[PDB]
Swiss-Prot record:
Keywords, alphabetical: Calcium, Calcium channel, Calcium transport, Cell membrane, Coiled coil, Glycoprotein, Ion channel, Ion transport, Membrane, Metal-binding, Sodium, Sodium channel, Sodium transport, Transmembrane, Transmembrane helix, Transport
Motif (Prevents fast channel inactivation): 793-795
Record-given protein name: Transient receptor potential cation channel subfamily M member-like 2
Subcellular location: Cell membrane
Coiled-coil region list: 919-941
Record organism: Nematostella vectensis
Residues of the full protein shown: 94 to 1206 of 1551
Amino acid sequence: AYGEIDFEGYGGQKRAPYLRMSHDTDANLVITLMLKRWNLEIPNLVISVTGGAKSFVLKPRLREMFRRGLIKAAKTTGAWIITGGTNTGVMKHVGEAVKEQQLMFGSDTQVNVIGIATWGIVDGAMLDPNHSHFFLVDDGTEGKYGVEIGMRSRIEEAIMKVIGVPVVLLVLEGGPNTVATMYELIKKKVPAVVIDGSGRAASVVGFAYNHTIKRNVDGQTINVIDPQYEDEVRAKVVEVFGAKGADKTYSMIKDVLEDEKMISVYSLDGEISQDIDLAILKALLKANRSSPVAQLNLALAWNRIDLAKSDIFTEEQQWTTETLSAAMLTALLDDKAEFAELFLQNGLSMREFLSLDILCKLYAEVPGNTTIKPLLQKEMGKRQVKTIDMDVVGEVIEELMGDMFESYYRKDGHYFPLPTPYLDVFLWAVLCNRRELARVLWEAGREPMAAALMASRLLKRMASRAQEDNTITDISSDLYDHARLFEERAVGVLDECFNENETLSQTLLVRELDHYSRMTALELAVSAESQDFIAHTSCQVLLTRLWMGTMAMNTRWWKVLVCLYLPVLIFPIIYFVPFCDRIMHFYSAPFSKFVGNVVGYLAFIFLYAYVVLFNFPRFDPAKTLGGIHPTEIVLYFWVFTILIEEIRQLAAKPPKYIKDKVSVYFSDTWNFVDIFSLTVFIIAIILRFFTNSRIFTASRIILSLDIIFFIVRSLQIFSVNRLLGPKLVMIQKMMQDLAQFIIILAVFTIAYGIALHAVMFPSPGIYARNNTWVTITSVVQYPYWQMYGELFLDEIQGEKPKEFGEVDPDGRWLSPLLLAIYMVFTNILLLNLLIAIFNYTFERVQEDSDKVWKFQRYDLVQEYHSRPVFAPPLVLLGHILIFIKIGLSPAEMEQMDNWEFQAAEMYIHQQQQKNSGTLEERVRALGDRVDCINSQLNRVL
Ligand SMILES: Nc1ncnc2c1ncn2[C@@H]1O[C@H](COP(=O)(O)OP(=O)(O)OC[C@H]2O[C@@H](O)[C@H](O)[C@@H]2O)[C@@H](O)[C@H]1OP(=O)(O)O
Ligand SMILES: *[C@@H]1O[C@H](CO)[C@@H](O[C@@H]2O[C@H](CO)[C@@H](O)[C@H](O)[C@H]2NC(C)=O)[C@H](O)[C@H]1NC(C)=O
Ligand SMILES: [Ca+2]
C-alpha cells in the first residue's frame, strides 16, 4: 500500500505521498526513491525535529519562538524537515508552523516535511495532514515504536552520504523514544541540538551536559556524568520521564554525551532572542563533517556573517574563485552585501567570477519591487524579446542617463573575461537600489568618482521616472537619498584628491573616461546636477582657469575691456600665466568673449531700442533704400550675426547626427529664447516690406515686443555675478510657480468678472454692452486691474457712463459688495498666498544660492568657451574666417586611475574612522569588550 493521501479539507491543495516500508530496506533505495521517483530537490540542510507525541507539554513563548525560528531556518535555506507521521506532539506543531507560514504567502515557499512513522499506529495515532511525504516503516503488529527509530537514523545517514547534506537534529520536550532516536542519530554522527529548559527529556540532557561536564579518560577524551550529581540525574531520569526500566534510558542518555562535537545544548532562557538557526550552524561547524561550501551557503541563507568570518573563513582553509562563485551569486542576488564584501576580500575576484551569462542572470533575477524591473520589461515590450541581455540593459542605461549617453554594452563585443567587472556589477547594484551592495562594489572598483556621479545620475533619474510614472512604485525618496549618498561619496573622493596635488585634481576632472561614453567627470557631474560636486574648490578653480584662458585668474573686467577694443594697449596691463600670440591668447579667453558679448550686446540693445523707439518707418519704393535708416541695416547685420552664432552652436554640438545635435541644442532654455527671438525677428522683418498698414503695424508691434525677448536672453550675462545669478534662478523658479498658480487666479478672476459684468451690464436690455468683445475683455480685464488695487469704484457704481458704460442701477449697489468680497479674497488672500509660494521658493534657493551659482558658472563657461576667437563687433567676420576633455597616455591614464583610487581609499578609510568614532559605534564596541571581559571571567571561573 503506497500512494498519495489527499487529506479531506485539512488545509492545502497539494497532496502528500506515502510509502509502506520495512526496516530491512536499505536507505539508499529510499533516498533514490525520494530523489528520483518523488522528485524532491537535494536540500542544503535536513532538520530532524524530535520530541513528545502524546504527553507533550509546551510553553507558549517557547512554542512561538521555536516555530518562528524553525520556519525562518527552513524556508530561507530550503531544508527538509524530518519528523514523525503523527497528528499530535511536536509533529503537530511543526506541521502547523509549516501551515501557518504558507497560506496567502509567496508561491515558491514549500518545505518538504517528511514524516517517518510506523505503519502499526496509523488508521495508535493519525498521520499529520500538514506533512509533505510519509515513510511508514514496520515489521510486525500494532503498538511497535522501535521500527521507526532505526530507519529514521539510516535514512538521514544516507542523506549525509549524498558529508554531502548537513543533517542536524533538534530535540525538544520529548520522552523515551525521543532519546532513543537521539542516541541512534548520534551513532550515525548527526549533530544534535537539545532545547534545554523546554520539557521533560530535553532538560535532563541539558542538565547532564553543562551541569555535569567532566573529562577524566584517554581515548578521544569523552564527556561523562559527574559522580557528585549522578544520584540527582538518576532521580530525575527515574521520576521525570519513564517509570520502570529507566536504567537503559539512563545508560542511553549518558552514551549520547560521549562525543562533545555531536551534542549541543541551546536553551530558551540562556539566549532568548537569538534564533535557532545559529545554534544549528554552530552544531554543524562544531561536528566538523560538512563541506566548506555547505557551511558557507547555510551562513548565506541565515545571514550569519560573524560566525562565517570566525570559523568558515579561517586562515588554514583557503578559498578559490570557483569555490566561491555560487556563494557570490547567492550573495549578490539575495542582497547580502557583507557576504559579498567578505567573498571579495578573502579569495575571489570579479574578473574571474563575473561573466556575460552571470551578468545577464544577475539582471534576470531582479526582485520586482525595484524601478529597474519595470524599466527592463518596458524595454522588452518595445523590443519583443522574451529574454534579457546586455543590449536591453545598455539601452535602459542610455535612456536613464540621458544627454546622448552611449552605454558600452551596446558597443563592446564582450557584452553581446569582461573588461570592467566591478563597474557593471556596480551599475547592477545601483539600478537595483541596493545601498550597501553598491557601496561595497564602489569601494572595490576603479574610476570611483566617475562611478559615483554616474550612480547619482542613475538613481535620481530613476527617482524622476518613478515619480512621473504610475506603473512604477514611487520609491523616489529612497532613490534621491541613495543619489545624494553617491553625490557625497564623489565629493569626498574629489576632496581627498584636492587635499594633495590640486593639479592632478584638475587633470582628473577633465579626463577621457572611455567606460562613460568619453565624457569627463565634470560632465557626469552636471548631467547628474550634482551641485555639491561643482561647488567644490577643485571644480571652481578649474572653471576659473577655463574662464581665464591663458590669462591671469584675477584680471578685472575693465582691463579686459580696455585691452579688448585696443589691441595695442594689451601688452602692458594683461598678465599671462606663462606679434599675435598674446593677441590670440587674450581673445581666446571666455572672459574676453564674455566682456565682448556684454559690450556688443548692450550696443545691440541700444540700437534695437533706437530702431523701435525713434526710427522704424514704413517701407516705400519712392525714396532711396526703401526709407530704411542705416541703423536698421546695422540691426539686420547684428541679428544675422546672432543667427549665424546659433547655427554655429547647433553645428558645434558633440553628436554627429542632426537630430541629436538638435536634442543637445535644445537642452538649455537659453537656446529656446534664442530661437524664439530670432524667429520672431525674422517674421517681423519679413512683414517689414509688405507696405500694408496692418502688416507693417504687426511688424513693428512684433519687433517692439521682441526686444523683450532679447533682453530676457541677456540674463545669462547677469549670471556671472555671485549675487545676481541666483536671483535669476529665483526669478525662473518663481515664474514656474506663477505658471502653476495662474489657473487658480484665472478661475477666481473669471468667476468674479462674469458675475460683475452680469450685474452691471445685463445682456438682453438697455444697459447691455452690445459688443461681445468688450464683454469678454471686461470680464478678463476689470477683475485683473482691481486685483492690483486699481478699484473702479467711480466706474462700477454707475458714474463715468461715457468711458465705462451705463451700469444697471440695481447693479450699482451690488458691484461694491462683489468688489469688496473679491478684494478680500484675491488682493489679500490669493495674492499673499502667491507671495508665500514665492517666498518658499526664495528660501529654498537662498539656502543653496552659493552652490547654485557655482553650478550655473559651468554653463556660463561652456557658452563662451566655444565662441569664435575674434573681435567682439566683428564676430560674424569671425564666423566667416572660421568657415574659410583631455586625452592622456595609457600609462598616464593608468597612473591617474591608481592615484584616484588611492585617494578614494583614503576617503573610504576616513569614512570608516568617522563611522567607528561615533557614539553609537563606540558604545557598541565597548559592549562587545564587556562581553569579552564576561567571557574571560567565565573562562577563569
Ligand atoms: N510516535 C508516536 N506517535 C503517537 N504516540 C506515541 C508515539 N510514541 C509514543 N507514543 C505514545 O505516547 C506515550 C508517550 O508519548 P511520548 O513519550 O511523549 O513520545 P516519545 O518522545 O517517546 O517519541 C515520539 C516520537 O516522535 C518523535 O518525536 C520521535 O521520532 C519519537 O520517536 C507512549 O506511552 C505511547 O503510548 P500510546 O500509544 O498513546 O498508548
Ligand atoms: C444695446 O441693444 C439693446 C437692444 O436694442 C438696446 O436696448 C434698447 O434700448 C432702448 C433705449 O436705450 C429702449 O427703448 C429699447 O426698448 C431697448 N430694447 C430692448 C430689447 O431692451 C440698448 O440700449 C443697447 N445698449 C447700448 C449701450 O448700445
Ligand atoms: Ca545659445
